C-alpha cells in the first residue's frame, strides 16, 4: 500500500523571510550599476559552472578539464567512463542520421 | 525517487467499482478486471 491513513503534518511556509523577501535582488546590477559586475560572477556554485549552460557530457568534460586534477581516483574513473559512454551514445546511437 | 504516484488506489478502485459484481478473482484483482471491464463496456 502507498496511501497513508493519517494526514501528514502541515508544512509551514513563511512567505516573508530573509531570502524570500530578498530574492532576485542585485541581478540587474550590471544594467543599473554602471556595469561594474555581471550576474554570472554573482551566483554561488561550483567552479566548473558559474554562468555556464551545458548538457551532460559537456559538463563532464568541463569539470574534468577544470577540477579534474583535484578529483578523487574513483570519481575520476567513473567520470571518464561516463564521458566515454556519452560520447559513443550521442555520436553513434539515436535517430536523425 | 522524486515523483511517485499516490492516487493509484483510487484510479484502480474506480475500475474495481465497475467490476464489483463479477465472479471469481476478476472482482478482486485489477489486471484480471481491466481486460474484462473494457470488454463489458
Amino acid at each position: 500500500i502507498g496511501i497513508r491513513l493519517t494526514l501528514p503534518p502541515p508544512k509551514v511556509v513563511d512567505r516573508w523571510n530573509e531570502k524570500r523577501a530578498m530574492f532576485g535582488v542585485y541581478d540587474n546590477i550590471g544594467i543599473l550599476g554602471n556595469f561594474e559586475k555581471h550576474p554570472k560572477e554573482l551566483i554561488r556554485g561550483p567552479i566548473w559552472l558559474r554562468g555556464w549552460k551545458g548538457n551532460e557530457l559537456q559538463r563532464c568534460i568541463r569539470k574534468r578539464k577544470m577540477v579534474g586534477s583535484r578529483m578523487f581516483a574513483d570519481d575520476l574513473h567513473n567520470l571518464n567512463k561516463r564521458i566515454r559512454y556519452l560520447y559513443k551514445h550521442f555520436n553513434r546511437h539515436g535517430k536523425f542520421r | 525517487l522524486r515523483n511517485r504516484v499516490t492516487d493509484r488506489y483510487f484510479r484502480i478502485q474506480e475500475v474495481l467499482k465497475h467490476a464489483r459484481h463479477f465472479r471469481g478473482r476478476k472482482n478482486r484483482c485489477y489486471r484480471l478486471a481491466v481486460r474484462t471491464v473494457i470488454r463489458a463496456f
Binding site: 496511501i3 497513508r4 491513513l5 | 492516487d7 488506489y9
Partner: peptide, 26 residues
C-alpha cells in the same frame, strides 16, 4: 513514505464515508 497530503485528504474523505455507511448516525 510517499510524500504529499492531497491523496491523504482524499483517502480521509473516503474513510469517513465508509465509517458513516458502516455506523450511520440517526
Amino acid at each position: 513514505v510517499k510524500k504529499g497530503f492531497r491523496a491523504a485528504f482524499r483517502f480521509q474523505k473516503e474513510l469517513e464515508r465508509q465509517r458513516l455507511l458502516r455506523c450511520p448516525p440517526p
